[PDB]
Amino acid sequence: SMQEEDTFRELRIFLRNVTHRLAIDKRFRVFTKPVDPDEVPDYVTVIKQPMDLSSVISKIDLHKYLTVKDYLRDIDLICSNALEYNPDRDPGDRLIRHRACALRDTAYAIIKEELDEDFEQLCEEIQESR
Ligand SMILES: C=CCNC(=O)[C@H](CCC(N)=O)NC(C)=O
Ligand SMILES: [Cl-]
């Protein structure tokens, strides 16, 4: 219905605002664009499901997220991809891991403070109806 379309539109406006707040934080610059194969040709061979915040915006705009849980799965991928590709004890890998954990924690903290649980439950029930 039109009222369900309006619910998904509100979801996309909420997700674009959360994503923009993460993307303008200087700690998370490395996560704003896909990894360039020039710099990192083994990336695409190790990480099978690359994800970054520009890809998340594109997904929102293609109507790929119908719940905040689905969006958070892609934020969790940005985090777990960085834990898997950069697992060493050296400071460059530790800094990327701590920035990726902090992205994930920040997205979950904004959602805890600003997502109404009844709005998420509504989205979940429309999704499940389809
Ligand atoms: C799992 C997310 C966070 N990762 C971290 O805590 C990183 C260190 C990496 C480690 N030893 O795991 N932060 C630092 C350097 O303090
Ligand atoms: Cl830096």
Curated annotation (Swiss-Prot):
It is found in: Nucleus. Residues 108-130 form a coiled coil. Residues 3-114 form the Bromo domain. Induction: Up-regulated in breast, uterus, colon, ovary, and stomach tumors. Induced in breast cancer cells overexpressing NCOA3 or treated with estrogen. Down-regulated in 5-fluorouracil-resistant derivatives of the colon cancer cell line HCT 116. Highly expressed in estrogen receptor positive breast tumors and in osteosarcoma tumors. Transmembrane segments: none annotated. Signal peptide: none annotated. Belongs to the AAA ATPase family. Interacts with ESR1 and NCOA3 and these interactions are enhanced by estradiol. Interacts with acetylated lysine residues on histone H1.4, H2A, H2B and H3 (in vitro). May be a transcriptional coactivator of the nuclear receptor ESR1 required to induce the expression of a subset of estradiol target genes, such as CCND1, MYC and E2F1. May play a role in the recruitment or occupancy of CREBBP at some ESR1 target gene promoters. May be required for histone hyperacetylation. Involved in the estrogen-induced cell proliferation and cell cycle progression of breast cancer cells. This is ATPase family AAA domain-containing protein 2. It comes from Homo sapiens. The chain holds residues 981 to 1108 of 1390 of the full protein.
